[PDB]
């Protein structure tokens, strides 16, 4: 779901 | 943003280790960061832009020869093209 190679920007994005 | 947070050293620490270090950038981070351009333009915070932009262009410039180049000419064209649209006219970096 989404990140296609494990998202660099997208991991650190606003989720906590 | 960048992300999550606004934050210049949140926007240099994921610009940064990016460009130098991910062999293949994802499409997902190059949305990410074209829809901030973009809107960094439209929410007046070409403040932002200056700072994201000059990062992202210097260290892509830099890089020899991977998907960086492109993504150097990628994202600055789109932003550029929407600054001309609405403040009328293109930042050039140099």
Redesign the interface.
């Given at each position: 779901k989404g990140n296609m190679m494990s998202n660099f920007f997208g991991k650190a994005a606003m989720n906590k | 943003?960048?992300?999550?947070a606004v934050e210049f050293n949140?926007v240099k620490t994921?610009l940064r280790?990016?460009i130098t270090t991910?062999s293949?950038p994802?499409?997902?981070?190059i949305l990410?960061?074209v829809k901030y351009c973009t809107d960094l333009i439209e929410e007046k915070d070409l403040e932002k832009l200056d700072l994201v932009i000059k990062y992202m262009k210097r260290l892509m410039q830099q890089s020899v020869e991977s998907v960086w180049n492109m993504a150097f000419d990628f994202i600055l064209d789109n932003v550029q093209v929407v600054l001309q649209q609405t403040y009328g006219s293109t930042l050039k970096v140099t």
């Open positions: - | 943003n960048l992300a999550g949140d994921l280790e990016w991910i293949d994802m499409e997902e981070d990410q960061v």
